[PDB]
Amino acid sequence: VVQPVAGILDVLDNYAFVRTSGYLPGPHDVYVSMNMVRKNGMRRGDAVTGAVRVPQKFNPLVRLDSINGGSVEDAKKRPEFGKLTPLYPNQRLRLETSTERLTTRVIDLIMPIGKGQRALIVSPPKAGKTTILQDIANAITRNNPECHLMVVLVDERPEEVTDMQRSVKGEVIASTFDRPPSDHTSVAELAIERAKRLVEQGKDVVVLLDSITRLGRAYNNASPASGRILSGGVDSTALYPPKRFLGAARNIEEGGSLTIIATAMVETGSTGDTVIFEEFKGTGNAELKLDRKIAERRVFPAVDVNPSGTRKDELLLSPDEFAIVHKLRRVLSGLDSHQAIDLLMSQLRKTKNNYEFLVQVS
Amino acid sequence: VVQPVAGILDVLDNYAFVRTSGYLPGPHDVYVSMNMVRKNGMRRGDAVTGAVRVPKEQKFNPLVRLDSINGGSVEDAKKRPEFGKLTPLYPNQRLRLETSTERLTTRVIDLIMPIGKGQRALIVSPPKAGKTTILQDIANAITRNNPECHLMVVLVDERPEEVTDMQRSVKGEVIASTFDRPPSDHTSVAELAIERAKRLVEQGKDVVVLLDSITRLGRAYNNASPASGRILSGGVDSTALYPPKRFLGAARNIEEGGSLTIIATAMVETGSTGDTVIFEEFKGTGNAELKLDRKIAERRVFPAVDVNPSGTRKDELLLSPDEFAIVHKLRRVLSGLDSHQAIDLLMSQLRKTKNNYEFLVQVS
Ligand SMILES: Nc1ncnc2c1ncn2[C@@H]1O[C@H](COP(=O)(O)OP(=O)(O)OP(=O)(O)O)[C@@H](O)[C@H]1O
Ligand SMILES: Nc1ncnc2c1ncn2[C@@H]1O[C@H](COP(=O)(O)OP(=O)(O)OP(=O)(O)O)[C@@H](O)[C@H]1O
Ligand SMILES: [Mg+2]
Ligand SMILES: [Mg+2]
């Protein structure tokens, strides 16, 4: 009957819905009773292909066809929760693809991204964030196509969702600003559950969430006041769910990983953004800081070299590469940011991200 | 028998009335059942022409026949919904506003904030800054220069005299609900107006909505219902900020054809915390903003725009590359100076009988 694949979502109550075409609650969704969920071993993020009875207000979804990876009898799935989470610098996500315009060799020498990492890009508005995210998505899709890239735009203009869909080869999930914050939270939750299920399958997943601050604000505005409402306009109980999202980024010793590259808003003129970013300090191992005052000088990507780095770099780079990168970082920390970024780009102009290593050692 | 003509409003329940007022719940509105809506392919905002029975008996007499929908046919209702259609960045085609040498309101707007078919504008203005004259000038320029665009002017809380003033000074549709009406009426008027704009865009036509005081719509939404979301926002409920965002975000271009411009106005420095909170919550949503400054208006210099924080986002697709370079140079020059000096210099140089003739002067 009605075949289209869609990510199933089990709402916290007894209701479970198949979000047709994904991921927002649509007007032609299909109802799933937990009887069928339990007799089928259904998770919270599977992609079903069942049929309906064409004439719970919605369809009954009788005669399920398939699940995301296997079938009904595939009830042997390793949970994300009760599972081992190694250090996750093991495998390296290469980002160098071209030399004419870099925008990624800098954030490759400065913030080595690895599979299963939990990155965080700090950026003031109008500093070069969307270009960086698009270039990261393109580099991830081209360098290693095995990664199941997906992009989550929690709160964006409808004009920008189309641009992202056209400039990114991966899957794009987005909720426009003209949606209730409940839709924002539901989309983020369903996206992270889909990523978790793909990890349990054994595939390296990359999630390029945009504006974790907007996700935190959506969680804040969705619910009324709660414990410790006095923090700057946001209650402390509303900063748990976003962390949970950012807490999903982990490696797996058996196989697979979940990389999350979220973006944080600072200097936005709202105290809530600064508060949310401050209470997120100490969770992301790799942090990249974009500086506004460097962007107005029309030099890009305009990263803050000194406060940007990666935790546990020993397991990502090769020992000789690690030594060279350490020497470069020491040299950059010797200088101030406004000159260090200029020197780094000046050296990177004439090289190909390896000749510079050859030049640096000399 | 009687032949009402009205724009249908489809309420959440099974009721559906045609608003032959229009757009305001009147004393006599023809009732339409859901069965008629489904059979005739009706949807909220459609312009409906049909017949109705004589008084027979249900306070409102149900509709009986239908002659036309939105000017078309009952069977020709195969138009695509707006939600499912692709929404480009909408700088593709710009609406020229400079129409005469004498008036410098539209010339300044064209130089500072270019407007294209599909923008989502926001005029930020304190009280007594020159907002109504600017809206009237924009409406006149749009009607004169772009007659193909269907012009709608929505007023949410206005004096009953100002509605007539606008109706006499504006040629397009003027929908208004005066302050002597419940906030539910302002809500219904705004929602029905935007749904009508959507239904016209689905036909491929260009619609331009001139909303007045999006803050008034936000306050009407806030007062219409008891607080249920995060009340701690500055006196205004957090749930009350969603429907105004929906109204403002309905302004999308269409790749298949059409556009829906929304030049809304936001009120700041009104002495109320609700207005400032709503405006702050509406940050980063509109891609064209014009800031009117009270202190510039007090100097009796108009249109009194605050140039530096006002501009269009992604105007590269609106302007030709040489014109874009010239405008970028002008914006750099203006940003070199403070607000008062910038507007004074712009007004002083704008008296060169055209905008293009100033651009030619700008090169040399
Ligand atoms: N790699 C790059 N090379 C050159 N210019 C760039 C680069 N990345 C961004 N820019 C500049 O940045 C602008 C494009 O917008 P940008 O990517 O900065 O938006 P953003 O950071 O998403 O901003 P916002 O918060 O408004 O959405 C242009 O001025 C463009 O020249
Ligand atoms: N283009 C213009 N040229 C000259 N004077 C102008 C112009 N536009 C507005 N004004 C002046 O503005 C006044 C007209 O009212 P105005 O447009 O300022 O009201 P408003 O912004 O709607 O105010 P309110 O907040 O009371 O509704 C007059 O003093 C008129 O001279
Ligand atoms: Mg952006
Ligand atoms: Mg006025």
Residue numbers in the entry:
A (entry chain E): 222 to 276, 286 to 592
B (entry chain D): 222 to 278, 286 to 592
Article excerpt on this structure:
The bacterial Rho factor is a ring-shaped motor triggering genome-wide transcription termination and R-loop dissociation. Rho is essential in many species, including in Mycobacterium tuberculosis where rho gene inactivation leads to rapid death. Yet, the M. tuberculosis Rho [MtbRho] factor displays poor NTPase and helicase activities, and resistance to the natural Rho inhibitor bicyclomycin [BCM] that remain unexplained. Since Rho has no structural homologs in eukaryotes, it is an attractive target candidate for the development of new antibiotics.
Moreover, the analysis of the closed ring dataset did not permit to compute a reliable and interpretable map, while particles corresponding to the open conformation allowed us to compute a cryo-EM map at 3.3 Å resolution (which led to the structure of the hexamer in the open ring conformation), showing an open-ring organization of the complex resulting from the assembly of six MtbRho subunits. The MtbRho is composed of six subunits adopting an open corkscrew conformation. The N-termini, including NIDs, are not resolved in the structure of the MtbRho hexamer. The presence of a clear electron density in all the ATPase pockets of MtbRho reveals that ATP ligands are held by a network of interactions involving the phosphate, sugar, and adenine base moieties. The adenine base is stacked on Phe530 while Thr333 and Thr361 form hydrogen bonds with the NH2 and N7 groups of adenine, respectively. These H-bonds explain the marked preference of MtbRho for purine versus pyrimidine triphosphates. Consistent with the open configuration of the MtbRho ring and the absence of activating RNA ligand, the ATPase pockets are in an unproductive state. Furthermore, the arginine valve (R387) and catalytic glutamate (E386) residues are too distant from, respectively, the γ-phosphate and catalytic Mg2+ ion to catalyze ATP hydrolysis. However, close inspection of the BCM-binding cavity in our MtbRho structure revealed that it contains a methionine (Met495) instead of a leucine (Leu320) in EcRho. This Leu→Met substitution creates a bulk in an otherwise structurally comparable cavity, which could penalize BCM binding by steric clash.
